Amino acid sequence: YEPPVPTRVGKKKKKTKGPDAASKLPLVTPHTQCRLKLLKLERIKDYLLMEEEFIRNQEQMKPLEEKQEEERSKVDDLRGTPMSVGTLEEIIDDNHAIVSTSVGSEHYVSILSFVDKDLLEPGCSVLLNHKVHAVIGVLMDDTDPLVTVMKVEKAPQETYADIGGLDNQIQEIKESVELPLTHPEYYEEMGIKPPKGVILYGPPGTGKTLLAKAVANQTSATFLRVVGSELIQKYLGDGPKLVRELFRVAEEHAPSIVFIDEIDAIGTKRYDSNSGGEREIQRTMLELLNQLDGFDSRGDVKVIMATNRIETLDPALIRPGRIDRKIEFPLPDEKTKKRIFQIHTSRMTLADDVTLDDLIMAKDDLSGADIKAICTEAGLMALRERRMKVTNEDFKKSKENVLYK
Amino acid sequence: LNAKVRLLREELQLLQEQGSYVGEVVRAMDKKKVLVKVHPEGKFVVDVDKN
Amino acid sequence: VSTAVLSITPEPNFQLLDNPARVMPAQLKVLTMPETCRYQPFKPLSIGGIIILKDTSEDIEELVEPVAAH
Amino acid sequence: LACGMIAVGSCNGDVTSTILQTIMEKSETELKDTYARWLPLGLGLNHLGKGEAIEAILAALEVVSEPFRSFANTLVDVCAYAGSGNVLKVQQLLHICSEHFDADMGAH
Amino acid sequence: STYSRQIKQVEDDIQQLLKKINELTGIKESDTGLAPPALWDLAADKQTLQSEQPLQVARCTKIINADSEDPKYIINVKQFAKFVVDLSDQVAPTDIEEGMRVGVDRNKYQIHIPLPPKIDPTVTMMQVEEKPDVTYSDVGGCKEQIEKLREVVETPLLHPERFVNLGIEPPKGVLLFGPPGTGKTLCARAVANRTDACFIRVIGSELVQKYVGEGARMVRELFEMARTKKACLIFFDEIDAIGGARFDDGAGGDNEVQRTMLELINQLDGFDPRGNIKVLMATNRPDTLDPALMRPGRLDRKIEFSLPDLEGRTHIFKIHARSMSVERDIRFELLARLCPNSTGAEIRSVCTEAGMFAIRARRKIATEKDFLEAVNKVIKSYAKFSATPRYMTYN
Numbered sequence A: 001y002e003p004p005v006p007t008r009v010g011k012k013k014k015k016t017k018g019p020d021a022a023s024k025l026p027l028v029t030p031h032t033q034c035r036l037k038l039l040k041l042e043r044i045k046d047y048l049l050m051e052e053e054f055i056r057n058q059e060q061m062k063p064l065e066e067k068q069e070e071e072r073s074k075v076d077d078l079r080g081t082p083m084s085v086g087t088l089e090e091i092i093d094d095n096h097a098i099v100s101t102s103v104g105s106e107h108y109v110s111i112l113s114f115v116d117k118d119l120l121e122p123g124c125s126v127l128l129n130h131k132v133h134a135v136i137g138v139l140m141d142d143t144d145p146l147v148t149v150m151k152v153e154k155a156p157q158e159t160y161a162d163i164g165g166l167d168n169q170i171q172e173i174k175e176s177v178e179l180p181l182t183h184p185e186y187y188e189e190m191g192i193k194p195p196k197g198v199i200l201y202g203p204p205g206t207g208k209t210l211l212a213k214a215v216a217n218q219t220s221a222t223f224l225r226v227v228g229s230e231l232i233q234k235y236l237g238d239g240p241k242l243v244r245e246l247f248r249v250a251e252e253h254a255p256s257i258v259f260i261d262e263i264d265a266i267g268t269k270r271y272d273s274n275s276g277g278e279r280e281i282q283r284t285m286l287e288l289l290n291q292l293d294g295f296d297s298r299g300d301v302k303v304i305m306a307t308n309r310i311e312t313l314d315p316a317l318i319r320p321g322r323i324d325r326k327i328e329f330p331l332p333d334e335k336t337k338k339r340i341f342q343i344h345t346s347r348m349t350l351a352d353d354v355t356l357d358d359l360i361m362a363k364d365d366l367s368g369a370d371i372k373a374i375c376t377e378a379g380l381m382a383l384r385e386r387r388m389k390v391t392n393e394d395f396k397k398s399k400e401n402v403l404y405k
Numbered sequence B: 001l002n003a004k005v006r007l008l009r010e011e012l013q014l015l016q017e018q019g020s021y022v023g024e025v026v027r028a029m030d031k032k033k034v035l036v037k038v039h040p041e042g043k044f045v046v047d048v049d050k051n
Numbered sequence C: 001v002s003t004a005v006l007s008i009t010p011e012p013n014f015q016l017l018d019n020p021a022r023v024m025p026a027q028l029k030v031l032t033m034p035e036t037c038r039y040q041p042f043k044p045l046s047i048g049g050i051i052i053l054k055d056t057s058e059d060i061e062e063l064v065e066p067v068a069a070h
Numbered sequence D: 001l002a003c004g005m006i007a008v009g010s011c012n013g014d015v016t017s018t019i020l021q022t023i024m025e026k027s028e029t030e031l032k033d034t035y036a037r038w039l040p041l042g043l044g045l046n047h048l049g050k051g052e053a054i055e056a057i058l059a060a061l062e063v064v065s066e067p068f069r070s071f072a073n074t075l076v077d078v079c080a081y082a083g084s085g086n087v088l089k090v091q092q093l094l095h096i097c098s099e100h101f102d103a104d105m106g107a108h
Numbered sequence E: 001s002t003y004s005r006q007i008k009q010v011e012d013d014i015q016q017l018l019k020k021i022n023e024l025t026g027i028k029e030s031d032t033g034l035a036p037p038a039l040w041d042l043a044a045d046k047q048t049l050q051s052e053q054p055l056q057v058a059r060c061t062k063i064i065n066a067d068s069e070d071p072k073y074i075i076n077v078k079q080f081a082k083f084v085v086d087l088s089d090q091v092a093p094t095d096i097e098e099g100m101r102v103g104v105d106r107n108k109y110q111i112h113i114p115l116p117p118k119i120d121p122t123v124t125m126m127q128v129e130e131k132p133d134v135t136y137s138d139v140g141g142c143k144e145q146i147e148k149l150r151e152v153v154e155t156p157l158l159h160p161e162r163f164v165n166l167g168i169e170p171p172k173g174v175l176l177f178g179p180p181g182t183g184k185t186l187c188a189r190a191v192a193n194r195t196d197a198c199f200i201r202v203i204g205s206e207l208v209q210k211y212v213g214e215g216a217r218m219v220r221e222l223f224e225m226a227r228t229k230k231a232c233l234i235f236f237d238e239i240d241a242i243g244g245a246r247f248d249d250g251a252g253g254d255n256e257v258q259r260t261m262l263e264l265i266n267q268l269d270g271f272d273p274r275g276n277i278k279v280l281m282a283t284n285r286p287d288t289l290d291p292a293l294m295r296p297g298r299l300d301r302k303i304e305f306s307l308p309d310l311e312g313r314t315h316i317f318k319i320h321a322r323s324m325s326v327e328r329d330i331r332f333e334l335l336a337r338l339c340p341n342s343t344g345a346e347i348r349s350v351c352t353e354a355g356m357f358a359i360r361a362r363r364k365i366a367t368e369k370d371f372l373e374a375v376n377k378v379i380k381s382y383a384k385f386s387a388t389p390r391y392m393t394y395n
């Protein structure tokens, strides 16, 4: 006896996912409505007429057993019912594989012709015949609950116009997460790949998460948001596993933007639920090192990190190649503070005795979060007193609440 | 009374018909296919009765 | 179909039944021979069965030819 | 194959004349041999890409017997419109592809 | 616009045609993993469903009376049961050995086909199947390093005849160490692109697992699967995740991970020969590695990826500025002199940022001033976050 030799190269599934399949019609150029586009479209139409006539002729004299509805009706007969869901363990040959049922028992079965052989990889969910356990299909895995959590289904309502004073900060983030997607020609004509990674660092409340919210609002790519504290897991290896799985979902939904908010919280915070101590966090860090810049080729995945403590990060994590741009978010100055106050009071109904200039110097170390909290609390004071107009006394009592006590 | 007697004799044959599994629907699929989880026996892709 | 054209390129209300006549028990009440026929039945034709027909005239008897059994 | 390659796309009548001359002189049985398939190819190469210059040649090919005539005329007609994209010409080829024979008859 | 009306008429007729074509052709749907109907050999599948019977995977345990003509085989059918069966008439007695997986029937459980050993699907995916787009021409300043790496991990497989003749046993392991961005993984990616043997990429964080004995187990199946091939390469990126030195801190500090390193050490150089595997380890913290792992026979070659010199930095600048639309007179030698101790990753960012200053200015060609501003932004302004100062102490 000799071992069977597969004809397919490798044991992984085809990288391409969700294509147009048989409808991959050519990109006829130009899009302008002129003669050669009409001429080009006619050629596509002509061959379809040839294709339509040829296929009809064959099926016309094909046997009654061999028909498009009959063969599909037959396919159900070979599959049978129910269709047991198993797990692919190993691909022994082109038409042979080892599968395991939910009971933990493995069977050496035969892969039928109608199964999509390009979707077969070990660990994938396969559909097996109830009687003979033969592979009769591949179950498209439903979206994991972990996939749904990262993905931001609805873009946040915060836009770049809602950000005040971060003109340079907004500009830098666009060239790494927005400009490469909207205008890739600028990079290609220049011969440089876009800046790989970006990190937003500064004092708390400076607008780091807000700029990512603005980025997520005006992006055509899938946005995945993960807090650094979410990467601390209860069991050994799940920390690295979650980081590995987070960047796998990003690769599936390419192009994608991965926002690792509060990245420093993975190390600056110690929890007893994390079985391994600082050593398990380091292994999680090393896994994140591989994902940002490692052996595996990276698709159109852009990484945004935010932290108010950049001195506590591993310098190897934010090294160039992993995080190219380090955008600083300073505390707002006088011009920015007035802009932030006008931004958060635009929908307000201010009184004639309320001046924003006095509120600018509420505190020397005033941040955007403090300004928004001052306004939000000031409106709450008016809501308590059953009013729609916010007075200076309402703002005065606002400062003593959020800033003090 | 005749219906009660007739239903009683037919019940004995009916009670010998094998019972039905209890499963949990994961998601519905095309061609009236449903992914279920039989309680001890893992997942299945099952048909849907015409009713 | 040819090749595709490319870019360039009154039941009657009655029926006469011969003798013998395969006649339903329901046809009995609705079956009656023509008045002008030379023969007239003794008992009413709606009775059915074998009926002997009276002869009004004395012309040549156009009988029926017996059929040999299979 | 050789004389077709020297005079490819030239419509040289001298090479054309002999290629027909050898073809119909041969007996029907030896036309079953697959080395006779190279004779229409030499004829086809001699008219490679010319297009409308084969009807006179296609006229001579009707005399040749079947199923080689089916093979012969298909080869030269295809070579006549090589690199032309004529959707009308590929209309007839699939018409040949539509009728399936239950080998010897379907060599072309 | 005079053809706008005629475009949509033929576009709609076309779209109707594909919908019509797909009706007869089929291939609609795929959620149940159905291949296109052009590949449906239903005649063979019906015969396959009958002629080829399903086989349960079982492991042979003990062969009873192998010498005699009635050899009985004890098999472990996973979670089902244990059976004492005999071989089928279509399989040689010498083809089934104790401890190997076999295929058995559902009626008499007689062994029908020997099977490959069970290997974790995670370990199987750890082998490289698409080679990276990095060649040795994309690595600058690492000339001497690259020859040492190739002559151990590439030359013996390519031209084995020049080693057997002289009785040479080439080194079977290379450790790449250096500060981050120095090109450790870049050179490994170049190795995988050029190599023709099997390349397996292992990340040290992938060997950290929830349960006790998994990391050692995955290492065992990693080398078990590597040994099923004539020549193999295993790349251990960031070995320091599991390669840390053993210690006793009272409690069980890193005891499980140390066992994973001990198993890896055992496979590299233990009682049994390793095979034809040439391992490749990359780490930015080689000072933390275990002394037994940093020993010849496990890591024979210690290739250091130090910071590039002036000639090396100039070479890296040319590699990354090859496709740039730079000016005619860009002084790359000057640029290399403005970043004395800078990794190759910084030089790439300098090249990328240099084109960014020009793209910002709506200029299609990057001047030398942009590279000068890029060095200030990358080498100088971003020097606060530089990993070089701390990591040269570790290397």
Ligand SMILES: Nc1ncnc2c1ncn2[C@@H]1O[C@H](COP(=O)(O)OP(=O)(O)OP(=O)(O)O)[C@@H](O)[C@H]1O
Binding pocket: A162, A163, A164, A165, A166, A203, A204, A205, A206, A207, A208, A209, A210, A211, A306, A307, A308, A329, A332, A340, A343, A367, A368, A369, A370, A372
């Ligand atoms: N420059 C700014 N312009 C406008 N609004 C701002 C600005 N900075 C902060 N804000 C407001 O502050 C709110 C809260 O701050 P935000 O969540 O952006 O903080 P951050 O800078 O990410 O800090 P951290 O996560 O460290 O607390 C935002 O929702 C936004 O409305």
Ligand SMILES: Nc1ncnc2c1ncn2[C@@H]1O[C@H](COP(=O)(O)OP(=O)(O)OP(=O)(O)O)[C@@H](O)[C@H]1O
Binding pocket: A289, A293, A294, A316, A319, A320, A321, E138, E139, E140, E141, E142, E178, E179, E180, E181, E182, E183, E184, E185, E186, E187, E282, E283, E284, E316, E319, E343, E344, E345, E346, E348
């Ligand atoms: N010698 C070099 N020549 C050319 N480019 C280089 C060189 N060294 C590094 N680079 C560039 O810098 C990037 C840094 O990634 P690389 O995989 O080389 O880092 P590393 O040495 O493995 O770092 P780490 O220790 O953080 O894993 C590479 O992708 C490559 O583009």
Ligand SMILES: [Mg+2]
Binding pocket: A208, A209, A261, A262, A306
């Ligand atoms: Mg935040």
Ligand SMILES: [Mg+2]
Binding pocket: A293, A294, E184, E185, E186, E237, E282
């Ligand atoms: Mg590396």
